[PDB]
Design a protein around this ligand. Structure first.
Ligand SMILES: *[C@@H]1O[C@H](CO)[C@@H](O)[C@H](O)[C@H]1NC(C)=O
Ligand SMILES: *[C@@H]1O[C@H](CO)[C@@H](O)[C@H](O)[C@H]1NC(C)=O
Ligand SMILES: *[C@@H]1O[C@H](CO)[C@@H](O)[C@H](O)[C@H]1NC(C)=O
Ligand SMILES: *[C@@H]1O[C@H](CO)[C@@H](O)[C@H](O)[C@H]1NC(C)=O
Ligand SMILES: *[C@@H]1O[C@H](CO)[C@@H](O)[C@H](O)[C@H]1NC(C)=O
Ligand SMILES: *[C@@H]1O[C@H](CO)[C@@H](O)[C@H](O)[C@H]1NC(C)=O
Ligand SMILES: *[C@@H]1O[C@H](CO)[C@@H](O)[C@H](O)[C@H]1NC(C)=O
Ligand SMILES: *[C@@H]1O[C@H](CO)[C@@H](O)[C@H](O)[C@H]1NC(C)=O
Ligand SMILES: *[C@@H]1O[C@H](CO)[C@@H](O)[C@H](O)[C@H]1NC(C)=O
Ligand SMILES: *[C@@H]1O[C@H](CO)[C@@H](O)[C@H](O)[C@H]1NC(C)=O
Ligand SMILES: *[C@@H]1O[C@H](CO)[C@@H](O)[C@H](O)[C@H]1NC(C)=O
Ligand SMILES: *[C@@H]1O[C@H](CO)[C@@H](O)[C@H](O)[C@H]1NC(C)=O
Ligand SMILES: *[C@@H]1O[C@H](CO)[C@@H](O)[C@H](O)[C@H]1NC(C)=O
Ligand SMILES: *[C@@H]1O[C@H](CO)[C@@H](O)[C@H](O)[C@H]1NC(C)=O
Ligand SMILES: *[C@@H]1O[C@H](CO)[C@@H](O)[C@H](O)[C@H]1NC(C)=O
Ligand SMILES: *[C@@H]1O[C@H](CO)[C@@H](O)[C@H](O)[C@H]1NC(C)=O
Ligand SMILES: *[C@@H]1O[C@H](CO)[C@@H](O)[C@H](O)[C@H]1NC(C)=O
Ligand SMILES: *[C@@H]1O[C@H](CO)[C@@H](O)[C@H](O)[C@H]1NC(C)=O
Lengths: 317, 165, 317, 165, 317, 165
């Protein structure tokens, strides 16, 4: 006679996995399905990464003197840093988060200057709170209009959209610290700014008073925006406190976004970006972050998941 | 089975296979058809069979630096809901996939065993330890005939039955 | 001896399905779980479908002269068309989307006229921008109040809810194009409209100025609404620019909704409506649209899913 | 098995069944009990066992004609999240259901085989091709007795064992 | 010879469960996975439960005379009752729901009085609509400022945050019923209230007019809030209608929340609270409510789910 | 099998076991190893294997007393979406878990049967009713030897084969 024995391989040291019927079963091999680490750096390929160094996207949009390098810049991902700071005339943006989202998803700061004509007013006013070069200045994409001589007319300007794309207009309203400023700056006891299209309008009333001092100023500027579609018309009506647009930003649609991260950017390639740096995307899940951009693994709570890649390991003994 | 009692730490040319003892001494060889079948099923499963990576771009904010009220509460709620559901899917999926891997590899072992048993027919007995006792002289050429699916039980029954009964 | 062979059937041409262990396995039969097509038409049964032909729900609500056919109409589903247009005094609705949602879910335009008494004012003013018949007109559910003789009193009117249901009041505020209109129309340099209940109030200040011309007018009307619950009271206070309610809409709860679709409506029966037309609901999933109404299959990305309805197909050879 | 080697394109009166050869020639008949059992399990599964159609009415807007900011971003996010999760559920469910259909129909075939093997006892041998070699004359009435569960192995052992050994 | 029979147990009466292949299969034993009932009472352990008896969280925050017992109180869960009512000067809170959420999640009403100095005005005005003791009164955390003698100066007060935590300030704006009240109460034809920080500002304009009468008053107070972070500064500017803060609420983060329930509270222990009372948390699912607090089972639609805890039950016959 | 024909309402000392008849009369005993194995798998499954209780605190409002418009519509939508997905997970999970419980307990029964069959080897025949006919005298000490895994088939073949053939 003869003996024919059937069997399978085993390994000296296997690994444990979980099944429906068993909490821990040893298997010959298992792989890891959760990516739990990053390189600590953001890769600059294949996506276009724009490092706002000390700028926020809104300061870059408005034209803060330290952000002059971002004029007409584009990105797939705009990266904000914790060290970013503003250094211009103090301002606020009602619904800041929406404007930040609109610009971030458009993906561009391409700006086209338009021939707005403002008559009977002094154009291009600035402040020592926004120095540009050795003297006073202002945001590069805004025009601070003030009285001319002893008057300030009601401004009524029309700017039609005869193009085949949407135009984004950024404008604002000045808020003087006192009654003695509003009548020396734009000779008006009660200003108003109205900006409208064929479908909607926004009217803003300035609010006089001292705020905490920021960069030497107790006054503020509020930022507002409007979108004009092809065939529509932009109309601006004001009797004081207008921080006029100088033109429009071209709007786009696409894959562009924004992230907050202090990670450095390097010469490597990775499709998945998290605020902790780029991660591999060769696993179905990750627990590095919830904030991701690009071709990323799904975020899960688990730090580890082991998937058997082989059979039960039963040692010889 | 012998494949329940243990595996072979000495088998490195495949996952499943045969080990034997006869008049020429002992030996071992992997079964490549069952090894590859188990591997193909696993390599498929480890790939994007029921899931794939999705590419996402602009999304909601997930972290906040200020206390806002209702909208922020809803945004956080939506994200936590998404995470709990995907975390659940990951647990269930991995446990189901691991359950199926163990079951398919145990089944491939049992299939090889039944396959062998019916080739041998009445010329061998199942010893209860993953082994067949062959009741006729079976040299190395015979063992390979069994291993590659060409064993002819009709040329051995006259001897094998005399030794069994 | 004899031979007894056991086996199973096979078919000349089977179909492929996916399993956990196999990417493609041939089976004797398989069914389709994703509904990927529509008839291109909306069925008018069992749901009540209201085709707004050239009307939007809001124009039907306000009483645009082309929408006079929708007075006191009801629906389970209101259908808006891409060809719909407005043709009345130009207007805007702050939070348009919420009003559209409220009315759509109520499911009715039933309107009850109330005995509001407006004294010292001229009632029922109209415009050539909203012609009704051969002459001027206005929205049928609104009352444009203007000066009487040389004055305009402050209007203070009270309308209690002594009923057992909620009342929806639609009202608005006029926005003159100039200072020379507001003092000839309702003799008031600065108008205000305040509408309130025992629980909340809304005060609107009119904004003077020219907007782009729509149907010959540079002026606008803003639409606002309030809901008065049983036991509460409606109070209206104004010193100019009031587009008064003429009564209330009765509010309801239920299954009613709204959809945007250019699909035609026909004499067929289907429980599931999508903007591409009605679809069958005999499959668990669909990929026709994400916008659905009624007893619909779940929307999935997949264009196809095959479910085996039989065993593996192994041909004889 | 013979049911691994192939199926029968010539069997149209059921899903599972028997084919035979004896002194009266050949023939075929479906097994209706295993055919119906496989069908009942499948018809159940193809029905609303773990899922059903839900009726929905007023819902959020899913398409937009204007750029709004945060609320719209959240509405889109919520809808995309819902779709990804239901698309996942559809892939996993169909693959699980298909895995179970293949397994239940293979099992019904194996059950019929074991059922037959124990009715025959020692009067037949498993040939390794889904067939039993019956070691006694077995005419058409005998074959039907095996098929309907009434075969009495005790009236054949005296002949069948002489032919086997 | 001998017979050795193998088998398994059975029970006289088993239970039915559902599987993938079978709609109903009898098993020896099965457990219930859906918790479908409550005790009807809320347990006061391990969580700290604060029963607002006739108070809402906002009345407790503002200082309604019936809620004086909740001063400096804390909770893990604040419970509102359907019987709760207000009994003070009539008020409204724009975005009521957000303020209710902020306070509920902070978990405390700890209040710190600050040395605000209001000069040229009369402090601590009250009303017969908010009686405290036998005479007139007001909300305990607010200061109603009115004219002093014949004047009312513009108030400009600065209150810096030099602490290491966020400060919540609650303040409001008075809305007189008439032109004859606003000039006798705070001698001003047009009041305004501006409250600001280094990052944002809120300016509120009062709205004159009669509202439905509540507790004898046709006038109203609107409630607003602001948060001042460490290093920031609170600035208040007003020329009339200011309901001043008296200090700040200390903000916290944590597990605190709010629920609406008419269930009584008792001396028992339970980690999961629903508005129908506490429930056990020894099952993975519940269908008691969707509103839960603490270590709760998941809410499902199903009233029952049976999980087999044993094998198929096949009776002897 | 006999375990398909019925279970034993008279077995209370375990889940799986043996019943016998010999020259000393009849008897019964539970098999504790297969009983405990089935129990351990089940107790694991009834525990937090792929799911656990999450502790949640502040959340969105889920009930409303007023008609608000878009935000409320989104909050309701988000909550309904969450409930439909968790209700689905509960149906699928329970049906999968019950499917696995039935399959693991049927398998433990079949494992005990195969285990017994290979201990007996050629000294017994499978009667098709979950029973083995033992072809040699087997007293109560013999039956316990089979039950505890110590039966030596080599001391019975000479008798058992004479009775089988
Ligand atoms: C298994 O791993 C341990 C460390 O966890 C090591 O000490 C041991 O030597 C390894 N054994 C074998 C056989 O590789
Ligand atoms: C086991 O899986 C790992 C991946 O985690 C792989 O690197 C390794 O080569 C595999 N080993 C075998 C024996 O296939
Ligand atoms: C931005 O692009 C426009 C395109 O017409 C061009 O006119 C303008 O000069 C560019 N500005 C900068 C800073 O390059
Ligand atoms: C108002 O208060 C600020 C401090 O925040 C102070 O700097 C400013 O001079 C004050 N102005 C008036 C009107 O007195
Ligand atoms: C990176 O991961 C850590 C957890 O280890 C997390 O705390 C951190 O927030 C993540 N990165 C950022 C900047 O979001
Ligand atoms: C199987 O092995 C035998 C012995 O080595 C050899 O003669 C025969 O040709 C082989 N058959 C096949 C199909 O490889
Ligand atoms: C199977 O389908 C193909 C077309 O896809 C057809 O040409 C072929 O003839 C069919 N075969 C049978 C047996 O029906
Ligand atoms: C196979 O399934 C289809 C449904 O896709 C059905 O129309 C057809 O009749 C079925 N055929 C058989 C053989 O049952
Ligand atoms: C609408 O219904 C009310 C119910 O009282 C009725 O008075 C009114 O005349 C109806 N209007 C139309 C256009 O039918
Ligand atoms: C204001 O500009 C518009 C063009 O949009 C023009 O029609 C209107 O007459 C102008 N009005 C004034 C005040 O000059
Ligand atoms: C109908 O389906 C198509 C995809 O083929 C989609 O583009 C379209 O938007 C759908 N219908 C509408 C009007 O939503
Ligand atoms: C089984 O078939 C035989 C032969 O045709 C017949 O005599 C017997 O009565 C049948 N038994 C049953 C239960 O149908
Ligand atoms: C089974 O339960 C029913 C009630 O549903 C009862 O009448 C019957 O007597 C019970 N039978 C046994 C064997 O316990
Ligand atoms: C069956 O399960 C229930 C829990 O629903 C338990 O109370 C009972 O003791 C169990 N019975 C057995 C026989 O284990
Ligand atoms: C609330 O706590 C503060 C802490 O400084 C204390 O000054 C104040 O008196 C306390 N108030 C009450 C009502 O206990
Ligand atoms: C305004 O109407 C109310 C009723 O809501 C009344 O009590 C009040 O006296 C009226 N006031 C005026 C200004 O006549
Ligand atoms: C308690 O459960 C019931 C359903 O029976 C539900 O109607 C009720 O709203 C729940 N409790 C509360 C107060 O939410
Ligand atoms: C098995 O049972 C026999 C008879 O009772 C006894 O002699 C033997 O020692 C037992 N063996 C074990 C391992 O318990």
């Amino acid at each position: 006679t003869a003996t024919l024995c059937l069997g399978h391989h085993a390994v000296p040291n296997g690994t444990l996995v979980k099944t429906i019927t068993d909490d821990q079963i040893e298997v010959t091999n298992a792989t890891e399905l959760v990516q739990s680490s990053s390189t600590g750096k953001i890769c600059n390929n294949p996506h276009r990464i724009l490092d706002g160094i000390d700028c926020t996207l809104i300061d870059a949009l408005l034209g803060d003197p330290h952000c002059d390098v971002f004029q007409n810049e584009t990105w797939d991902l705009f990266v904000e840093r914790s060290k970013a700071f503003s250094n211009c005339y103090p301002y606020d943006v009602p619904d800041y988060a929406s404007l930040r989202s609109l610009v971030a998803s458009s993906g561009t700061l391409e700006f086209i200057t338009e021939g707005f004509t403002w008559t009977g007013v002094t154009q291009n006013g600035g402040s020592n709170a926004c120095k540009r070069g050795p003297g006073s200045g202002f945001f590069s994409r805004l025009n601070w209009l003030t009285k001319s001589g002893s008057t300030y007319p009601v401004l009524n300007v029309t700017m039609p959209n005869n193009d085949n794309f949407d135009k984004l207009y950024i404008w604002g309203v000045h808020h003087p610290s006192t009654n003695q400023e509003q009548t020396s700056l734009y000779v008006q006891a009660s200003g108003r700014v109205t900006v409208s299209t064929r479908r909607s309008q926004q009217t803003i009333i300035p609010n006089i008073g001292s705020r905490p001092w920021v960069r030497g100023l107790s006054s503020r500027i509020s930022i507002y925006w409007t979108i004009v579609k092809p065939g529509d018309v932009l109309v601006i009506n004001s009797n004081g406190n207008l921080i006029a647009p100088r033109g429009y930003f071209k709007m786009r649609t696409g894959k562009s976004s924004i992230m907050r991260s202090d990670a450095p950017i390097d010469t490597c390639i990775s499709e998945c970006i998290t605020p902790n740096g780029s991660i591999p995307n060769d696993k179905p899940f990750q627990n590095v972050n919830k904030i991701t951009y690009g071709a990323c693994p799904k975020y899960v709570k688990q730090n580890t998941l082991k998937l058997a890649t082989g059979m039960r390991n039963v040692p010889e003994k | 089975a012998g494949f329940i009692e243990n595996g072979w730490e000495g088998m490195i040319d495949g996952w499943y296979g045969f080990r034997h003892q006869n008049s020429e001494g002992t030996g071992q060889a992997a079964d490549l058809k069952s090894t590859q079948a188990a591997i193909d099923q696993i390599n498929g499963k480890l790939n994007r069979v029921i899931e794939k990576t999705n590419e996402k771009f602009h999304q909601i904010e997930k972290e906040f630096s200020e206390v806002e009220g209702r909208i922020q509460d809803l945004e956080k709620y939506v994200e936590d809901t998404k995470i709990d559901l995907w975390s659940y899917n990951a647990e269930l999926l991995v446990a189901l996939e691991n359950q199926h891997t163990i079951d398919l590899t145990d089944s491939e072992m049992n299939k090889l065993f039944e396959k062998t048993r019916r080739q041998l027919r009445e010329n061998a007995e199942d010893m209860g330890n993953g082994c067949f006792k062959i009741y006729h002289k079976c040299d190395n050429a015979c063992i390979e005939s069994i291993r590659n699916g060409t064993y002819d039980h009709d040329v051995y029954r006259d001897e094998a039955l005399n030794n069994r009964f």
